[PDB]
Amino acid sequence: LVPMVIEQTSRGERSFDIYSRLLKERVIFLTGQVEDHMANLIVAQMLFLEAENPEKDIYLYINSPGGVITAGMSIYDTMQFIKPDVSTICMGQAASMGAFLLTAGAKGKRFCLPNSRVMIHQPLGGYQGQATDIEIHAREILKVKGRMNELMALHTGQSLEQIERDTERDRFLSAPEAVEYGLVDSILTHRN
Amino acid sequence: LVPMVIEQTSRGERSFDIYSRLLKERVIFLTGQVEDHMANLIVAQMLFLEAENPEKDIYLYINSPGGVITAGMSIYDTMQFIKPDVSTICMGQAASMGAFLLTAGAKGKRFCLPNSRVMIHQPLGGYQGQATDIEIHAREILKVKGRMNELMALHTGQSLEQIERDTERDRFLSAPEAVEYGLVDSILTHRN
Amino acid sequence: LPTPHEIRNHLDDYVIGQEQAKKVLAVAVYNHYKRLRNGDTSNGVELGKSNILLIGPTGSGKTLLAETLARLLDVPFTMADATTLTEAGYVGEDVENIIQKLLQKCDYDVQKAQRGIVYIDEIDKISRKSDNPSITRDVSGEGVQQALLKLIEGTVAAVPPQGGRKHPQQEFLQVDTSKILFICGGAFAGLDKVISHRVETGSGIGFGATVKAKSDKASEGELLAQVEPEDLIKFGLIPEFIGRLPVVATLNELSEEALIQILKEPKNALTKQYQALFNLEGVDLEFRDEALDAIAKKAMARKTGARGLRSIVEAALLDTMYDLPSMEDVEKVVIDESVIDGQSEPLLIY
Amino acid sequence: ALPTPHEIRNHLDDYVIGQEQAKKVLAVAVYNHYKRLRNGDTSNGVELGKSNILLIGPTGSGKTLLAETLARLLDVPFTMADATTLTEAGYVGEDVENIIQKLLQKCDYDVQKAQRGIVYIDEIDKISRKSDNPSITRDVSGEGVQQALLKLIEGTVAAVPPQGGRKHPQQEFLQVDTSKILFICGGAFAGLDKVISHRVETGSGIGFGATVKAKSDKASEGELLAQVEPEDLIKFGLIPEFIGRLPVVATLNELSEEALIQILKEPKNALTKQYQALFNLEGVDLEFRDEALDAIAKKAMARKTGARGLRSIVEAALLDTMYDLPSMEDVEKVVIDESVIDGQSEPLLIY
Ligand SMILES: Nc1ncnc2c1ncn2[C@@H]1O[C@H](COP(=O)(O)OP(=O)(O)OP(O)(O)=S)[C@@H](O)[C@H]1O
Ligand SMILES: Nc1ncnc2c1ncn2[C@@H]1O[C@H](COP(=O)(O)OP(=O)(O)OP(O)(O)=S)[C@@H](O)[C@H]1O
Ligand SMILES: [Mg+2]
What we know:
The structure is cut from a larger assembly and holds two copies of chain A and two copies of chain C.
Chain A: E1 4-8, E2 13-17, H1 18-24, E3 27-31, H2 36-52, E4 58-64, H3 69-81, E5 86-94, H4 96-103, E6 111-112, E7 117-120, H5 131-156, H6 160-167, E8 171-174, H7 175-181, E9 186-187
Chain C: H1 4-14, H2 19-37, E1 52-55, H3 62-72, E2 77-81, H4 97-105, H5 110-114, E3 117-121, H6 142-153, E4 157-159, E5 173-175, E6 181-186, H7 191-199, H8 229-235, H9 239-243, E7 249-250, H10 256-264, H11 270-279, E8 284-287, H12 289-302, H13 307-316, H14 318-323, E9 332-335, H15 337-341, E10 347-349
Bound molecules: phosphothiophosphoric acid-adenylate ester (2 copies) and magnesium ion.
């Protein structure tokens, strides 16, 4: 059950769900396995906030174990299309897609909690059928792997060759290690 | 959980769900597997917006892996029927039906995101029973295959022969490749 | 006495594009005079009174029709405005002086005054309004409509003749208002909204429904023709006042063709005015036939009727007029359709 | 002889900077008005008609300044009125006929001169309705005032007392036709920009196909006002009949940073010259650096008060100096620089 909170406004008191109340403050929650349905919801939230104030910065809390690539690209392209700088924060963990979206945030506005755990790996897929069809699908995942590695190098700043070697197998990076790699910019230990 | 947003109006404050708020701005979301129920919902939104303002243009955000053909034709026929031009934007991906609806948009108003993935294939179906019944259903699906190819050639602008060759097996086209093929017109990289 | 054709012909000379409205006015005034000639109605049934209501958009010739009609008719014609009129005993004005004003035209003779015509312009400006706490009293409104309504019901009005002194002297010339034609012409701005809410069917949503685009949704023309007493009451007019005005002459927004004629056909047309202005400086002005069409198109968009024409001409000729006196060797200036658009400059002949 | 529009504009340029369009409209209108008076409607078969001007413009743009400067060179009698004071007939506030009464006073109650006169009505936007709807309750100072002006603008006999309005039967009110009295209605229509933006700007949605400007790329008040149409004024509150009476519409532009810098020294009566004269009579010399003037312009623009903003900046910078300058001695010259405007340093004093 989601709790309801009261907001005091000039017109009068209004009741908001905990997630809607934070949405009003330009906070979007990315949680759980990434998929088409939740991704379109995040996309709608981003576009809605852009119209309200395209100058103020949006925030995207990321606690997810990853998911579909296509659903994630919709969020990534939306973050880059809109004018507001999307400030990504990592809570708990950020897997392949959560990390790709985390590093996709605006330069200087990417953060991670001290005990968060980031992980980056190559795409996962499979196909059953004729040899001809297998070749077709095999080339796509390779292109997706190359396309995702190119973008990671652009945001993190690491060379494309280094990203390939590190992304060949699951690599776990702590919050300080992620700062050196380039996935994040700073760590939020305490409120100053 | 779908978040709720507040819209300021002359009458006063109004509360809308994130999807309904965007519907007010002539935005329809096509997400997930295409089927009879979701298609009828999209049809109802197109007709509703036509009455409100038949001059303004409607937008359709397609992120789907495809689905039933009959359900898609209900959407396609509705788009061509109504006077408003329907602008199709591909987010994440657009499979066989999603791609057919994507290219079916108004000439010049079809868009695609940079990291989107478009795939077009021929219809797939199956029937179990007597040989006589097999001949009936086998002829019907072939007719649909020809009909779908004829419509894609019209929207894309490619020859019918070329479409048959390319759609014989799954073909994946990126956003720039789709522009050349004719499925989409331009790419929305950044807000201008 | 004058035939309706004769009345319509005279109005046509000065009014363009109001053929339908002119017919109603000519028939109404002709029927009114016929009733005056007959004594006791010449029959058991009572003939209906003739009271016209000149409702129309701005710059539609409402005032022009009344002013030009007086020239043809020998009867005395007086013109008043409801805006100035206020309740009796107040600083604004008194409604009863209208009869006195009419008598002044015919040197205070009751016989001529009875056959006179009255034109109350800006009748819509006295529409009933709700009470305001800050205001002491609403002198203008339904109270003014009651005084005017009394004259329509038919009542002898006491008027002091030859500008009688403050001493009463019991002159009180009685002039009956039953035979005095009463015409009220005003532009009821906003009436289209109430009329549309009543006669607009609405747009359906289904496949077989009829969708109405904003382009061909509706217009004030063809909408005011369906005016009824209920809509006028909502505006603020008293119901009794509406019943006393059966004849209703509704004007329509001038068309492109009508505006083109006004530009050149009248003797005091806008083009001739500027031509005389330029001639006073030693230059002649020429307007191309195509330019008039463009000016009429721009004027129609302004929605200010005939007055819109002056705006377009002044804007197009603003630059040349500013530099024409300072310039030399300029003997002729020509304007065409391209100049109206603003892309081109006024052509100069050297 | 008859002054040309260029000559009339030259006088306006001396006092007004940057309002080129307003000067042209005013000069042409004055030029045409003189021609009608110079050549009465006697020979011409056609009767010349007047065109009224509507001076729309933001605050401190020179609307009121143009009218005052015009009276300096206007041979015809001229007077300025205030729409706020005006009220509809039958109310304690005022009457529209009072405007004509003021004009007659300028010409010593001369009916013929009064008929051929130019009148200016400032703050005309104050009497505008709140919405396109006519009203909910009677409006004494609003549409009612506009309804009474219709006859005055178009033309009608106006009753005004001949001399004192006393000891006269029926007050012997003079009847003066206002058909030839040119009317200039200048007002600062605040909020009209959003009305024009509603129709001019479209596509304000939430999705990818929407248009987002971020308040930086949006059209400014000056640009939006230039696209003003009569339909827009209907929504703002102006009566449709009233707008028709005013065919000519002049739109003033917002004073830019460069324009404000010129206003500080270029006009005949400039802000710098005013303060300079204050120092000259007390035995001191006031000098303003070119860089200082540029700094003042930037601060004034932020205030949003237009030209009036410049006065505030100068007052604050010289607040302390003016307080101690008279008591001080051995003060021969004062120099103002950009640093003083910023507040970093005190203005230099010459001993
Ligand atoms: N039908 C017309 N034919 C010729 N000129 C016209 C016509 N209608 C308007 N005009 C011109 O416009 C001027 C004003 O016309 P009006 O009769 O006052 O229009 P209106 O409808 O009475 O406007 P108001 O403000 O509602 S009284 C006239 O003096 C003519 O110059
Ligand atoms: N174009 C200008 N050139 C020089 N000084 C100007 C100019 N515009 C404004 N000013 C100065 O600002 C003062 C006031 O200008 P106004 O003409 O009253 O502005 P405004 O258009 O009347 O704004 P209002 O009164 O609020 S509607 C003038 O006395 C000048 O000192
Ligand atoms: Mg002013």
